[PDB]
Structure 1
Amino acid sequence: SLAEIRTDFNILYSMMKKHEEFRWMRLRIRRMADAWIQAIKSLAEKQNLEKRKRKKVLVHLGLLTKESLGELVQWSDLITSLYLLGHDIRISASLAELKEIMGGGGVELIYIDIVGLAQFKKTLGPSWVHYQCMLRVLDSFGTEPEFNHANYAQSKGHKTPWGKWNLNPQQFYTMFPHTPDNSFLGFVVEQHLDIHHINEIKRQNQSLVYGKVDSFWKNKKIYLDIIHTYMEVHATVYTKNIPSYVKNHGILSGRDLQFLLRETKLFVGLGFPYEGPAPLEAIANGCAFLNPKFNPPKSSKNTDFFIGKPTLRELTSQHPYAEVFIGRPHVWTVDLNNQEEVEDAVKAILNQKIEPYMPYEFTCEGMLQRINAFIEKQDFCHGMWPPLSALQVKLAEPGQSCKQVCQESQLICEPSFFQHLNKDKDMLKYKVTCQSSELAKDILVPSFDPKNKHCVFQGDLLLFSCAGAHPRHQRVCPCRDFIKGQVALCKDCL
């Protein structure tokens, strides 16, 4: 009943069967096996992984069910991580498997997607709610508290089918750390590198466009022409939106793709798809990424793709994580409408020398560290973690969210600490003095009126929210530090 790390994948391979998607996952794991094994050994050497209880874990991929790319990568990496950490995983990709595993009892943790969660509620019936606190819900784009709370969402006039699960929003697991109301899960970036001679290996004038679908290339000719002034333009398109000068390789194997990326100086974003793995994979191969700037930023308010998504988060660019957490020289964020910004970026990139780069949180060891911490430390099944010693209170100005204020102090909003900031005497300890006070059910409180020292406190604890700016008042905001290149975990959270 204690967990032991695994260092061989044969059992994993036998458990991942009967779906095309798992065939693809098995191949990526085989490519990545040596990296994985080194990382689990390296982690266990640096950090105490003794005396962990072996958990029985349901992994339900609603995505692969009949009754129902980055999601499949994340699933694979989560499964791999759980297996290496020594947990007892029950993989389900059908209603029948879901029924049996749950019907068998002793499940202690449930990893599931949004489509799988509807299936869980239906299959289990009313008692699904008895397992609520064990759910970890892979949800790429994130769910904000305002949408997660079914009655509040309705009260706010939201007309989406999504959200309304009434979970602790930290139970939503996201693709990138864009939504501090949620937990960041992420994935691992594949890299097969060479890393010294990379500038010799690279064909200095070779660009590769990101975008397998012809429709994504609609209206990018001028942009591409600028790029083509300095660089060959290559593509992998499965073609009447593609300029005649494009060297279209079509569908390439993973191994042929890796070769092409090895030789590529610049991976070119068109604007869509949003926030995938592929720009990080190019950067991991020493490519620069030209990242379309979205001014105005894209959200449910102006973009069809985002209408109905249970979040008001806005995207500042095609890949905001790349833009903000990586930046130059690897990533050049440019407005496609500004021909001069594009041109200068391309010229700079041509004259740059860059090394393969991967943020630590997207390596094997990084992901193992993160998910191990969540498994060992995150518990929503009691009345904890992160430790209160990590709390640093900041005051957001009007029109500024708790998300924003923590960010600009080089911190991150930590929603589990809202509870510690929700009454007069607790405020005093953080240099915040309440003259007058009152309770409201709103995502925007706890709030502070600095004119007349008035404190408004949260009266529906499910509505605590990093997201959201007070139009008039200041917000009192819970922040925490993070381990560098590992934003999911405070310094004292291992």
Structure 2
Amino acid sequence: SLAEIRTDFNILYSMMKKHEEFRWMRLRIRRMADAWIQAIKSLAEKQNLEKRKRKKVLVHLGLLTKESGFELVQWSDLITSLYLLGHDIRISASLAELKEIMIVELIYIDIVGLAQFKKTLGPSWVHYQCMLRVLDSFGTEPEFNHANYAQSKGHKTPWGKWNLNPQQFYTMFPHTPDNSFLGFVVEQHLKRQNQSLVYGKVDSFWKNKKIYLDIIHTYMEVHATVYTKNIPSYVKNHGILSGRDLQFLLRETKLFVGLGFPYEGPAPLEAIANGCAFLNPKFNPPKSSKNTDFFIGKPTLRELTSQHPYAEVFIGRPHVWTVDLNNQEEVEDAVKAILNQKIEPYMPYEFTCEGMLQRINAFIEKQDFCHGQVMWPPLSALQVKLAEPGQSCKQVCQESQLICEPSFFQHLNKDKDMLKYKVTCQSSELAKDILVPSFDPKNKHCVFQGDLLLFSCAGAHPRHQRVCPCRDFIKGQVALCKDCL
């Protein structure tokens, strides 16, 4: 009944072949087989992976059911990680298989599949909800997760209102510390020219970018991989390329040119992994559900400061140049600096096979939401910081090379507890608000949280200071504190 790491993928191929939609993921795993097997072996050498309980795991892809009416790289890398860790995976892609499978101990599912889960099981779905790990690309902030609080704000979300522990939501990039960062692996299939490659397979992505692209064209060739109105005539199109052929072109390319869309994708990381610089359009104002139709109705008010905020903040220069495209002299300076500077290929640790294996194994072994409030990460990692007015708990932790840990909020929510962190409450009141525990420096006063489901890393107090729980993290592995293994 103990998990045994796997080093042969034959059983995984037979599992994935039962679903036609995984055809190209089976091809991707076969390419990445050696990288996966070397990573699981390396993880078993660096950490004690013995005596782990074998878990029966449901993986329900709601987006693949025909009832949804409706991405897959994350699912495959999650399934592969579970498989290599030795767990018992039951893949579901319809209401029928979901009914049959529903002895289960972990449920990976998307929000669309979650509504199918609630309907298939009826009221006893809440009996299982602490086992849910909800793949939610753009993240869910507590303001939208708390159904009654969402109504009080007027939030119209088809995606929120689920009243889960917000750490049960698993995001595509570490942009929402209220959630868990699941991510994926950037596949690496493997002389550089004065040429750029535009990020964008759709011609409509190129509208209005002529002035922008003309600046780059002054210094480099402009290449593309497009399916042609908005494409300048000087663009050297390559057509659609296999992933392997795309990476050879990336090794030939100095600059990967972002157009502003799509947001938060894997392609910039794959460019950087092959020695490309990424020109990352900066957004003023930042784009969110409040001002961008692409984000309308998302269960979050997160603001994207650029096309790829992860690349902007967690990678940065010299690999990522975040520039407002209207600042033509700044764009000229960036393209020119990238022209002579030699950058070496860079891949963040958390987006490698071993990084994800370590991350997902820690989540499986340490994340427990079935006994009320949480005890992992350990309290030892708690580093308290006070955010300034207009600053969120996410920001005050990030600026100090830490990250907000929502499970620590419970330890900063009363008078006596605040003494340990050098904040003296002459007087205290309680509020049900995502912005508390708030501190009042100009006047003694503390406001504590009256609804524990409203603990929120996101959100900035407009007048007061926020008491913010931060934690360290293993370098290149934002999801794990140093003592979290």
Q: TM-score, normalised by structure 2?
A: 0.98
Query: Cα deviations across residues 100-127 of structure 1 (Å, max 9, x unaligned)?
Result: 111xxxx000000111111111221221
Query: Cα deviations across residues 109-155 of structure 1 (Å, max 9, x unaligned)?
Result: 00001111111112212211111100000101000000000110000
- Tell whether 2:106 aligns with 1:109: yes
Distance apart, 1:69 and its partner CA: 18
Distance apart, 1:22 and its partner CA: 0.4
Distance apart, 1:279 and its partner CA: 0.3
**Secondary structure in 1 matching 2:194:** strand
Larger deviation, residues 402-411 vs 176-185: 402-411
Query: Cα deviations across residues 200-239 of structure 1 (Å, max 9, x unaligned)?
Result: xx33212111111111111101111111111111111122
Distance apart, 1:245 and its partner CA: 1.1
- State whether residues 63 and 70 of structure 2, in contact with CA within 8 Å, keep that contact through their aligned partners in structure 1: no
How far apart, CA to CA, are the structure 1 residues paired with 2:440 and 2:351? 41
How far apart, CA to CA, are the structure 1 residues paired with 2:317 and 2:402? 21
Where structure 1 has 5 or more consecutive residues not aligned to the other structure, the ranges are 194-201
The answer for the alignment partner of 1:381 in structure 2 is 370
How far apart, CA to CA, are the structure 2 residues paired with 1:387 and 1:452? 33
- State whether residues 283 and 289 of structure 1, in contact with CA within 8 Å, keep that contact through their aligned partners in structure 2: yes
- State whether residues 135 and 171 of structure 1, in contact with CA within 8 Å, keep that contact through their aligned partners in structure 2: yes
How far apart, CA to CA, are the structure 1 residues paired with 2:21 and 2:274? 25
Larger deviation, residues 48-57 vs 19-28: 19-28
Larger deviation, residues 170-179 vs 229-238: 229-238
- State whether residues 3 and 85 of structure 1, in contact with CA within 8 Å, keep that contact through their aligned partners in structure 2: yes
How far apart, CA to CA, are the structure 1 residues paired with 2:394 and 2:129? 26
Residues 70/467 of structure 1: CA separation in 2 closer, same or farther (3 Å cut): farther
Distance apart, 1:258 and its partner CA: 2.0
- Tell whether 2:450 aligns with 1:459: yes
Query: Cα deviations across residues 164-191 of structure 1 (Å, max 9, x unaligned)?
Result: 0000000000011100000001111111
Distance apart, 1:412 and its partner CA: 0.5
- State whether residues 265 and 287 of structure 1, in contact with CA within 8 Å, keep that contact through their aligned partners in structure 2: yes
**Secondary structure in 1 matching 2:31:** helix
- State whether residues 189 and 244 of structure 2, in contact with CA within 8 Å, keep that contact through their aligned partners in structure 1: no
How far apart, CA to CA, are the structure 1 residues paired with 2:117 and 2:248? 42
Distance apart, 1:70 and its partner CA: 15
- State whether residues 25 and 76 of structure 1, in contact with CA within 8 Å, keep that contact through their aligned partners in structure 2: yes
- State whether residues 70 and 276 of structure 1, in contact with CA within 8 Å, keep that contact through their aligned partners in structure 2: no
Q: Select the residue among 439, 445, 448 that pairs with 1:448.
A: 439
Query: Cα deviations across residues 29-76 of structure 1 (Å, max 9, x unaligned)?
Result: 111110000000000001000010000000111121112299111111
Residues 233/333 of structure 1: CA separation in 2 closer, same or farther (3 Å cut): same
- State whether residues 447 and 476 of structure 1, in contact with CA within 8 Å, keep that contact through their aligned partners in structure 2: yes
**Secondary structure in 2 matching 1:70:** coil
Query: Cα deviations across residues 319-341 of structure 1 (Å, max 9, x unaligned)?
Result: 00001110111111111111111
Query: Cα deviations across residues 350-402 of structure 1 (Å, max 9, x unaligned)?
Result: 10111111011111111000000000000000131000011011111111111
How far apart, CA to CA, are the structure 1 residues paired with 2:113 and 2:236? 40
**Secondary structure in 2 matching 1:16:** helix
Stretches (4+) displaced over 6 A: none
- State whether residues 64 and 70 of structure 2, in contact with CA within 8 Å, keep that contact through their aligned partners in structure 1: no
How far apart, CA to CA, are the structure 1 residues paired with 2:70 and 2:364? 22
Distance apart, 1:20 and its partner CA: 4.0
Query: Cα deviations across residues 284-320 of structure 1 (Å, max 9, x unaligned)?
Result: 1111111101111111222111111111110010000
How far apart, CA to CA, are the structure 2 residues paired with 1:125 and 1:264? 54
**Secondary structure in 1 matching 2:59:** strand
**Secondary structure in 2 matching 1:340:** helix
How far apart, CA to CA, are the structure 2 residues paired with 1:73 and 1:9? 17
- State whether residues 289 and 331 of structure 1, in contact with CA within 8 Å, keep that contact through their aligned partners in structure 2: yes
How far apart, CA to CA, are the structure 1 residues paired with 2:391 and 2:306? 20
How far apart, CA to CA, are the structure 1 residues paired with 2:478 and 2:306? 20
Query: Cα deviations across residues 240-282 of structure 1 (Å, max 9, x unaligned)?
Result: 1111111122222222212222211111100000000110011
How far apart, CA to CA, are the structure 2 residues paired with 1:18 and 1:153? 40
Q: Select the residue among 282, 286, 301 that pairs with 1:293.
A: 282
Distance apart, 1:343 and its partner CA: 1.0
Distance apart, 1:18 and its partner CA: 4.2
How far apart, CA to CA, are the structure 1 residues paired with 2:231 and 2:115? 40
The answer for the alignment partner of 1:139 in structure 2 is 136
- State whether residues 59 and 90 of structure 1, in contact with CA within 8 Å, keep that contact through their aligned partners in structure 2: yes
Q: Select the residue among 201, 207, 215 that pairs with 1:212.
A: 201
**Secondary structure in 2 matching 1:126:** helix
Residues 70/271 of structure 1: CA separation in 2 closer, same or farther (3 Å cut): farther
Q: Identity across aligned pairs (percent)?
A: 100
- State whether residues 70 and 277 of structure 1, in contact with CA within 8 Å, keep that contact through their aligned partners in structure 2: no
Larger deviation, residues 370-379 vs 238-247: 238-247
- State whether residues 377 and 484 of structure 2, in contact with CA within 8 Å, keep that contact through their aligned partners in structure 1: yes
Residues 118/134 of structure 1: CA separation in 2 closer, same or farther (3 Å cut): same
Distance apart, 1:192 and its partner CA: 2.7
**Secondary structure in 1 matching 2:329:** helix
- Tell whether 2:80 aligns with 1:86: no
**Secondary structure in 2 matching 1:230:** coil
How far apart, CA to CA, are the structure 1 residues paired with 2:45 and 2:133? 28
- State whether residues 288 and 329 of structure 1, in contact with CA within 8 Å, keep that contact through their aligned partners in structure 2: yes
Larger deviation, residues 31-40 vs 450-459: 450-459
Residues 341/326 of structure 1: CA separation in 2 closer, same or farther (3 Å cut): same
How far apart, CA to CA, are the structure 1 residues paired with 2:38 and 2:262? 33
Where structure 2 has 5 or more consecutive residues not aligned to the other structure, the ranges are none
- State whether residues 204 and 350 of structure 1, in contact with CA within 8 Å, keep that contact through their aligned partners in structure 2: no
- State whether residues 81 and 371 of structure 1, in contact with CA within 8 Å, keep that contact through their aligned partners in structure 2: yes
- State whether residues 269 and 291 of structure 1, in contact with CA within 8 Å, keep that contact through their aligned partners in structure 2: yes
Residues 254/192 of structure 1: CA separation in 2 closer, same or farther (3 Å cut): closer
How far apart, CA to CA, are the structure 2 residues paired with 1:70 and 1:99? 20
Query: Cα deviations across residues 450-485 of structure 1 (Å, max 9, x unaligned)?
Result: 122111111111000000111111111101000100
Residues 128/277 of structure 1: CA separation in 2 closer, same or farther (3 Å cut): same
- State whether residues 259 and 281 of structure 2, in contact with CA within 8 Å, keep that contact through their aligned partners in structure 1: yes
- State whether residues 276 and 345 of structure 2, in contact with CA within 8 Å, keep that contact through their aligned partners in structure 1: yes
Larger deviation, residues 267-276 vs 228-237: 228-237
Distance apart, 1:160 and its partner CA: 2.2
The answer for the alignment partner of 1:486 in structure 2 is 477
